[PDB]
Design a protein around this ligand. Structure first.
Ligand code: NA
Ligand code: NA
Ligand code: NA
Ligand code: NA
Ligand code: NA
Ligand code: NA
Lengths: 252, 252
């Protein structure tokens, strides 16, 4: 069985270091049940304190990184900077960056290749928008994205990739995703991997559900056979995060 | 006389926290001559250590910030986060972000308004590209940018604005800027301010030269009457930074 994986994405939160420290102390006291690999992603500015203070059985992640080691890229944070502090993970391709910050697939593949070649592990995000969901073309859209991702992955690095499916069509659209939606698209992704890079890899890669995950739906989502975990949004800031981490006991 | 102002922009450098700490220890030992306001901008990830360890007579600056207090903006760092740690400054509108990260004037004006309304001080960057320089339309282009900036500034906040002119036309183009180029464009900007917001404000706002500044040209640049200081690139990482900070003795 693949090890269940839960990434907590704080996004651009909290507002103060005092709040981030309080949240860390809450995470540190949580009793994890079952078996699960937990990663916490936070704003660059809080990454030093998170790495220093977060429980050592969990790992810290950046929410984005640039494509280069360093250079004339005012405002950007790079792989060597966060790796120099012991941070092993980054999220790439999150819907908010693809959209608001206009990150395209070419930019994202470069990031994934550079990050992996430089020893990082990645949570690579994908997912289709409302028009493609409505048109019933969700699998084609998601395939194209995964197909741009695939050649970024060096030989031997699939152990360092996790994929998160975001139902962007259910974010701020008036539509909601069902548990079966989540299962279906995670299976779509697994099958794309099997067809393109082989069953051995497909059978080991964790594919996460990245839509709305809360204490009230995490257990039924975890039980879906192709859902290997979550990239959690707003609940990653709340005590409910632990219920989600613990939903691993319902996945087999 | 306006107080001479030197901002050191590390850009996306150095690669490691060990290097940033060594650079800080170098800055801390430097003997400043004359009178000058010094700000050091560094990657988000190094801002905590810079704020903790940098000499207290100088101030730390972010190299960019987002337009919102917090929220669903994966990868972004916000004003309250850096203000919560005592950081008072940010750079906005740097050419590398306008270009590589595709930041437009509307995005940048929003940042400046939000930053200022939230108690930040800003270094707002502007500057024209090669085609406008060649066409002799450098002043019109720069005016338009400043004209988008101006309504972002709340009543009473001009004391918290510094403007940096970047001769983008001389970055990676095969063309170099002269000392007279720097003076001319800093004067162009001052005159736009005087005409649009009044002489009192124009006479107090520091306008910096943001092109290539090194130990070998800083004294002649500082002596230009409308050049009030520098936003320094690569030399901000080198012992030469101090020669630049000290070029204030040549400006009157
Ligand atoms: Na279809
Ligand atoms: Na490997
Ligand atoms: Na499952
Ligand atoms: Na002209
Ligand atoms: Na004021
Ligand atoms: Na001067």
């Amino acid at each position: 069985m693949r090890t269940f994986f839960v990434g907590g994405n704080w996004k651009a939160n909290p507002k103060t270091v005092e709040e981030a420290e309080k949240l860390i102390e809450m995470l540190n006291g949580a009793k994890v049940e079952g078996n699960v690999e937990v990663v916490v992603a936070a704003p660059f500015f809080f990454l030093p304190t998170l790495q220093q203070k977060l429980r050592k059985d969990w790992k810290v992640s950046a929410e984005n990184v640039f494509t280069k080691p360093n250079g004339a890229f005012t405002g950007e944070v790079t792989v060597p900077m966060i790796k120099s502090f012991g941070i092993e993970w980054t999220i790439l391709g999150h819907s908010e960056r693809r959209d608001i910050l206009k990150e395209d697939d070419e930019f994202l593949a470069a990031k994934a290749k550079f990050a992996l070649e430089n020893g990082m592990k990645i949570i690579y995000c994908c997912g289709e928008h409302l028009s493609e969901r409505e048109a019933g073309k969700a699998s084609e859209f998601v395939s194209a994205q995964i197909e741009k991702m695939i050649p970024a992955i060096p030989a031997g690095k699939w152990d360092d990739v996790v994929i998160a499916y975001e139902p962007i069509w259910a974010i701020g659209t008036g539509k909601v995703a069902s548990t079966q939606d989540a299962q279906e698209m995670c299976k779509v992704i697994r099958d794309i991997l099997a067809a393109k890079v082989g069953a051995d890899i497909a059978n080991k890669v964790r594919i996460l559900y990245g839509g709305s995950v809360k204490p009230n739906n995490c257990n039924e989502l975890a039980a879906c056979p192709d859902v290997d975990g979550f990239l959690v949004g707003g609940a990653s800031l709340e005590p409910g995060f632990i219920n989600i981490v613990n939903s691993n006991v319902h996945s087999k």
